[PDB]
Design a protein around this nucleic acid. Structure first.
Ligand SMILES: [Zn+2]
Lengths: 48, 159, 346, 31, 58, 49, 58, 126
RNA sequence: AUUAGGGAUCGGACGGCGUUUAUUUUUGACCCGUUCGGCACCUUACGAUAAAUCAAAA
């Protein structure tokens, strides 16, 4: 269940009120792919 | 009373008699008092201190008369820390022991400082208006309450 | 990616460092542990342990030799020597329980120790003469200690006064410098190895970067992915800082945030230091001054620094009204770094 | 919608209000 | 002055003992005061120091 | 460039540290005609004169 | 807008300040060695390990 | 008035969490609240606390507390029911803890698993 | 559980570098600092939520 680094960026940049869900994202057992873009638009990221 | 006199119990009985006679010009709790109880264990290394267990109305008898009294007791008697205390046989009894230990100063605060694990410490902070002649007695008082109760409480003037 | 990874304790790991040879060290409330990361096959199990001394709050390690010290919360610090000690030497203020957050080994004068205590109070120590040396009590609490890696008598403390205080060991009569730079209370300090710079890492979303001699903000740093910075320390070039967050991140940032490093050309460094010198000459005029001090700042933080300024202005107003309409008028106005200390104690 | 709401009952401050219907439903999910 | 004195209180005892430790430490700080003064009132400081240069005199 | 403003530096320092002309003074201020408590002090001093 | 608003704190007098600056570091008006010696920085940090100082220097 | 001085304290606790204050002042205090602070410091949401008498409590915190809450009807629960209550309260089964008064005293669901006891759910923290 | 304080508002009560009552002590008027209590502004919400209601529908 992979998480693009853009998505991880979006869920940190969201307010502290989602910190639990951000932790759940932050979990280490699930792989990650970097990206090459500018500025954290997750939808563009996934569709690419 | 309750005691058969020991080697220094008879000494303090004779001492209250020699405070009755051949001295002041002050006698209120001297004559109606007898041998009641006492205990002597060392405080720290080498240093020692005496606790004198006292009947419960003679506590307020002493609170009428304790000025100059512990002073003469220390300067004639063995040159160690003299301290009066009540004679009792839970928590409120412990607080009574505390407030009777610290006789000239009223306590103000009881801080039960907890630690990062399950350990706790007790501290009592005293009054500011008397601070001078209490610090070199603080270690003594704390060793007394530890040896009498087993609980480690530290005494402070807060800063 | 990672070099080497293992779990270490149950509770939150309060402390960590490396040994002067290669091994690394972990304090948490469960205890003190020692692993070796750069083993050629990896092991997860530690190779040294301790569990005695209560909750261990922090570590401090020797500049050169194999000494380390563990600050506990029992009002006690205790020092081990590697390969030749088991429980170490237990030193404290001889009648003291109040907790010891951190401790930094000096690297100017080795074999010297300072630590903070929760009586709003600091204690200087020595290792030759195994005893505390001095205890200063200030107005409100202090959070993490440091001494300067060039100026030996100069120390700095990070304080719940929201303040970085530069003290000097020989003379605790006045604060040498007051850095009144925050809204929330500072979580960390680290001296640059140049001895000329300083990271002050807030609880709030703000690093502020500093020289030794301003008294105010040279730099503010943040980004909103990092709510509450905790451990804020320099690298060995004194160019690049590290920033361990609350949001689960290690960040690699720069000091003097506009200097693009590498290997320049001669005319390039000419132009850069030309800019430096020119700005040095004219660093006071309104125009260049405001375009100089105009950073950008997150909203709650800026609202709060306006709050702080208004409230402290009212506080100073009440103080001066009390002075002018009290008998304090016929006295000397004490300066603020004099006012900085409450009391000092031996 | 707030993540930090558990899926059982209504909260007023830190008072999470649960009905006996909800608690009996938990018992039914156990059974 | 071979006379032994009255054993003073432990508080004042440790006070003067750690005061002596403080005087020792202050001596060991005065042994650098001049160098810190140099690097303060000096012209141009340099880093890294060639004294911790791991290849110093080769 | 970079020289000091005299009036502004006087305001800065102030905010930091904090018989023959009076006749033309009255003749100039007799046309205002604010009651002017400073002119009250000036009138009492001209009366003592 | 270009006139000096506050006297910079290290200085003391108007003539001190305004006759102190008085001179351009810039290249068109002074020599090249003048340029180098004026524009060199107060600290010079070269590249590598800056460990704290070991021995006294001064 | 709110008779649960427990919940009033915890209201102040989550208020300090939301406001970023690193301390509190629980003006009326009691031992069950003290036991709750002991377990919250057992697993480290809170730095360190103490109690003063005339009684109030000061508690220095981190920020790693997210929420504390009380179970108002003070419900009974058993072991498989403990597992179901755990999953129906918490976000994920390896985060946070619930607060269970057992006959062995007060403990979390993890300690309740270690010691194999049932009891009453009164609150929780994550 | 507070907002977040500040500006003022007066009811006490406390203090004082001081002016005027005061021929000098009371005491009173002006000014300041402390303290509770409240009518209310404004900002920030600490959030809201059914919005036009908000320092309360937080
Ligand atoms: Zn992408």
């Amino acid at each position: 269940i992979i998480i693009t680094s853009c998505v991880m960026a979006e869920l940190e940049k969201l307010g502290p009120r989602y910190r639990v869900a951000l932790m759940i994202a932050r979990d280490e057992r699930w792989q990650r792919l970097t990206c090459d873009h500018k500025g954290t638009y997750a939808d563009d990221c996934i569709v690419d | 009373s309750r005691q058969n006199p020991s080697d220094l119990e008879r000494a303090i009985a004779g001492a209250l008699y020699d405070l009755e006679t051949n001295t002041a010009d002050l006698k209120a709790a001297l004559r109606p008092l007898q041998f009641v109880s006492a205990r002597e264990i060392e405080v720290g290394h080498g240093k020692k201190a005496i606790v004198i267990f006292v009947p419960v109305p003679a506590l307020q008898g002493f609170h009428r008369v304790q000025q100059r009294l512990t002073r003469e007791l220390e300067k004639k008697f063995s040159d160690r820390h003299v301290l009066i205390l009540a004679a009792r046989r839970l928590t409120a009894v412990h607080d009574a022991i505390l407030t009777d230990l610290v006789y000239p100063v009223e306590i103000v605060g009881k801080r039960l400082r907890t630690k990062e694990d399950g350990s706790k410490v007790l501290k009592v902070i005293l009054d500011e208006k008397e601070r001078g002649g209490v610090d070199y007695r603080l270690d003594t008082y704390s060793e007394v309450y530890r040896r009498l109760t087993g609980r480690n409480v530290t005494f402070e003037f807060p800063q | 990616e990672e070099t080497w990874r293992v779990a270490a304790h149950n509770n939150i790991v309060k402390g960590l460092t490396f040994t002067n040879d290669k091994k690394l060290l972990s304090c948490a409330t469960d205890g003190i542990k020692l692993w070796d990361p750069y083993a050629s096959p990896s092991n997860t199990t530690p190779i040294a342990t301790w569990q005695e001394g209560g909750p261990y709050t922090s570590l401090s390690f020797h500049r050169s030799a194999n000494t380390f010290a563990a600050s506990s919360g029992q009002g006690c610090i205790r020092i081990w020597d590697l390969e030749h000690s088991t429980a170490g030497q237990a030193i404290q203020w001889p009648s003291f329980v109040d907790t010891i957050t951190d401790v930094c080994f000096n690297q100017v004068e080795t074999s010297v120790i300072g630590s903070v205590a929760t009586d709003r109070s600091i204690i200087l120590f020595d290792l030759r003469t195994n005893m505390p040396v001095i205890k200063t009590v200030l107005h409100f609490a202090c959070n993490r200690i440091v001494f300067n890696p060039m100026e030996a008598m100069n120390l700095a403390v990070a304080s719940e006064d929201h303040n970085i205080y530069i003290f000097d060991a020989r003379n605790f009569d006045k604060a040498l410098n007051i850095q009144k730079g925050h809204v929330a209370a500072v979580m960390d300090v680290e001296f640059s190895p140049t001895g000329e710079e300083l990271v002050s890492g807030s609880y709030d979303r703000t690093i502020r970067l500093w020289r030794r001699d301003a008294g105010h903000s040279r730099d503010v740093y943040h980004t909103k992915r990092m709510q509450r910075v905790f451990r804020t320390m320099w690298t060995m070039d004194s160019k690049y800082i590290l920033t361990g967050s609350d949001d689960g991140n290690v960040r690699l940032w720069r000091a003097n945030a506009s200097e693009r490093s590498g290997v320049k050309a001669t005319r390039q460094r000419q132009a850069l230091e030309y800019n430096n010198a020119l700005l040095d000459r004219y660093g006071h005029l309104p125009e260049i001054r405001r375009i100089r001090r105009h950073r950008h700042l997150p909203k709650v933080v800026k609202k709060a620094t306006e709050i702080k300024r208004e409230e402290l202005a009212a506080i100073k107003r009440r103080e001066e009204n009390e002075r002018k309409h009290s008998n304090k008028k016929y006295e000397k106005r004490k300066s603020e770094r004099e006012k900085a200390v409450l009391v000092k104690q031996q | 919608r707030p993540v930090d709401l558990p899926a059982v009952g209504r909260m007023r401050g830190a008072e999470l209000r649960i009905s006996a219907k909800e608690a009996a439903a938990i018992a039914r999910e156990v059974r | 002055s071979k006379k032994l004195e009255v054993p003073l209180a432990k508080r004042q005892q440790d006070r003067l003992m750690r005061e002596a430790a403080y005087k020792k430490t202050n001596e060991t700080l005065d042994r650098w005061i001049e160098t810190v003064k140099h690097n303060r009132r000096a012209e141009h400081l340099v880093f890294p120091l060639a004294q911790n240069a791991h290849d110093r005199g080769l | 460039i970079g020289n000091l403003d005299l009036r502004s530096e006087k305001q800065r320092q102030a905010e930091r540290d904090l018989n023959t002309a009076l006749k033309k003074y009255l003749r100039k201020q007799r046309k205002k005609n604010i009651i002017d408590e400073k002119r009250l002090k000036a009138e009492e001093l001209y009366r003592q004169m | 807008k270009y006139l000096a608003t506050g006297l910079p704190h290290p200085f003391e007098s108007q003539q001190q300040y305004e006759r102190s600056l008085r001179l351009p570091v810039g290249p068109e008006w002074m020599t090249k060695e003048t340029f180098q010696d004026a524009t060199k920085p107060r600290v010079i940090i070269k590249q590598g390990i800056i460990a704290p100082m070991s021995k006294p220097m001064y | 008035v709110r008779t649960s001085v427990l919940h009033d304290a915890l209201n102040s606790i989550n208020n300090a969490e939301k406001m970023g204050k690193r301390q509190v002042m629980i003006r009326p205090s009691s031992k069950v609240i003290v036991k709750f602070l002991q377990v919250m410091q057992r697993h480290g949401y809170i730095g360190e606390f103490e109690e003063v008498d005339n009684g109030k409590i000061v508690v220095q915190l981190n920020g790693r507390l997210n929420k504390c809450g009380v179970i108002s009807p003070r419900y009974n629960v058993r072991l498989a029911e403990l597992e179901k209550w755990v999953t129906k309260l918490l976000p994920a089964r390896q985060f946070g803890y619930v607060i269970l008064t057992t006959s062995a005293g007060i403990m979390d669901h993890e300690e309740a698993r270690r010691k194999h006891v049932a009891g009453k759910i009164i609150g929780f923290f994550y």
